[PDB]
Design an enzyme around this catalytic site. Structure first.
Site, mmCIF file in Angstrom:
data_model
loop_
_atom_site.group_PDB
_atom_site.id
_atom_site.type_symbol
_atom_site.label_atom_id
_atom_site.label_comp_id
_atom_site.label_asym_id
_atom_site.label_seq_id
_atom_site.Cartn_x
_atom_site.Cartn_y
_atom_site.Cartn_z
ATOM 1 N N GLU A 200 8.152 8.511 -24.418
ATOM 2 C CA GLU A 200 8.340 7.968 -25.793
ATOM 3 C C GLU A 200 9.669 8.374 -26.361
ATOM 4 O O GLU A 200 10.297 9.378 -25.971
ATOM 5 C CB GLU A 200 7.182 8.344 -26.693
ATOM 6 C CG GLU A 200 7.033 9.774 -26.916
ATOM 7 C CD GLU A 200 5.927 10.093 -27.912
ATOM 8 O OE1 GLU A 200 4.747 10.032 -27.526
ATOM 9 O OE2 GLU A 200 6.276 10.383 -29.076
ATOM 10 N N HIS B 25 0.558 -0.440 -31.566
ATOM 11 C CA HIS B 25 -0.362 0.218 -32.517
ATOM 12 C C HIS B 25 0.390 0.508 -33.806
ATOM 13 O O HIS B 25 1.648 0.469 -33.833
ATOM 14 C CB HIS B 25 -1.007 1.497 -31.968
ATOM 15 C CG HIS B 25 -0.073 2.623 -31.708
ATOM 16 N ND1 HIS B 25 0.469 2.871 -30.458
ATOM 17 C CD2 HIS B 25 0.263 3.684 -32.490
ATOM 18 C CE1 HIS B 25 1.165 4.010 -30.584
ATOM 19 N NE2 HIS B 25 1.113 4.485 -31.770
#
Ligand SMILES: C[C@@H](C(=O)O)C(=O)SCCNC(=O)CCNC(=O)[C@H](O)C(C)(C)COP(=O)(O)OP(=O)(O)OC[C@H]1O[C@@H](n2cnc3c(N)ncnc32)[C@H](O)[C@@H]1OP(=O)(O)O
Ligand SMILES: C[C@@H](C(=O)O)C(=O)SCCNC(=O)CCNC(=O)[C@H](O)C(C)(C)COP(=O)(O)OP(=O)(O)OC[C@H]1O[C@@H](n2cnc3c(N)ncnc32)[C@H](O)[C@@H]1OP(=O)(O)O
Ligand SMILES: [N+]
Ligand SMILES: [N+]
Lengths: 144, 144
Positions: A43, A84
């Site tokens: 990430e 998300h």
């Protein structure tokens, strides 16, 4: 209570290319990078702004570490895009218990580790009108 | 420059039901509702937080007014979920011209009306790694 948008989780095939897209196009710089082996992601967090609750709002770009992962399965099915949304709270445990008591599926019994030592849980997208929804308490207690 | 996450655009089949989901589950209340006939949406804005640039961050819930619309087509293909992300700026015209000069498709020649009299444009999702990306300047000049 949920007091901010903490981040937008965005799935991509190539973290370094997508990071460069955001830097070149918008001037957004990398605030932090890490690998979460449990979640199966590499990430990068890009900080967009600070928030009125003492926290911040980020883009969380996510490359899967493995095909057999939430993001690897999602990318295979849907291609690159928003995976998300995440809301911040000072007390993820308490807010997750309250939401569990409404019949919305909370995916973890107990919050798990997220970015920058945060404590995280997820709500099932089929109980949230199609949106995979994360609840986040930052590791550093922030000052409203 | 892009100085905040302005909103998350979330497509739904039934605005009133989805508004109630967000209120019941998270305590988020309606900041504003309006119909944008040009865009083909009924929208509700839910304010989540204020931001360090003097603006705010919202959930923008969107029901299509007609099947032959961006959101009606998207819902038919994908079901309910996140439709777009929006970044705020003090000068949408200038930032859109700079991004056009990078070869990212800007969908409008000139910004169009968005929620609460804002001026908006969009970047094509296929040029943004799968994310339909909106740029927003609020109608009320906000104070960092
Ligand atoms: C590290 C942390 C941080 O803050 O740093 C992160 O963000 S980690 C980010 C990565 N980690 C996570 O996402 C963990 C939480 N997610 C999960 O546990 C999973 O992805 C589930 C939400 C349980 C879905 O897993 P499942 O095994 O059901 O996969 P599936 O393909 O069968 O999905 C079942 C149904 O959910 C839908 N579905 C799956 N993923 C979705 C998503 N991201 N958004 C919306 N809907 C989604 C599918 O389309 C399907 O709908 P149909 O019935 O229409 O077929
Ligand atoms: C009012 C304002 C406010 O602030 O109040 C709003 O937010 S109004 C919100 C509603 N208005 C808008 O969204 C206006 C901007 N959007 C548009 O003009 C359109 O939706 C386009 C982005 C041009 C897509 O239209 P198009 O005619 O190409 O539809 P299409 O189904 O053929 O899409 C072509 C390709 O784009 C992909 N695609 C379409 N919509 C997408 C979306 N929301 N996110 C990500 N990808 C998307 C499709 O999957 C397809 O990929 P494949 O090649 O893989 O098939
Ligand atoms: N996340
Ligand atoms: N929007």
């Amino acid at each position: 209570s949920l007091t901010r948008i903490d981040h937008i989780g965005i799935a991509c095939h190539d973290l370094d290319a997508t990071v460069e897209f955001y830097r070149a196009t918008y001037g957004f710089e990398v605030f932090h990078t890490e690998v979460n082996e449990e979640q199966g992601v590499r990430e990068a967090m890009l900080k967009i702004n600070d928030t009125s609750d003492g926290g911040a709002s980020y883009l969380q770009l996510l490359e899967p570490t493995r095909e057999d992962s939430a993001v690897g399965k999602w990318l295979a099915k849907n291609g690159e895009g928003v995976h998300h949304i995440a809301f911040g709270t000072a007390d993820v445990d308490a807010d997750a218990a309250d939401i569990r008591d409404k019949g919305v599926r909370v995916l973890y019994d107990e919050p798990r580790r997220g970015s920058m030592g945060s404590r995280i849980t997820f709500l099932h997208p089929k109980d949230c009108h199609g949106v995979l929804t994360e609840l986040v308490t930052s590791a550093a207690v922030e000052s409203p």
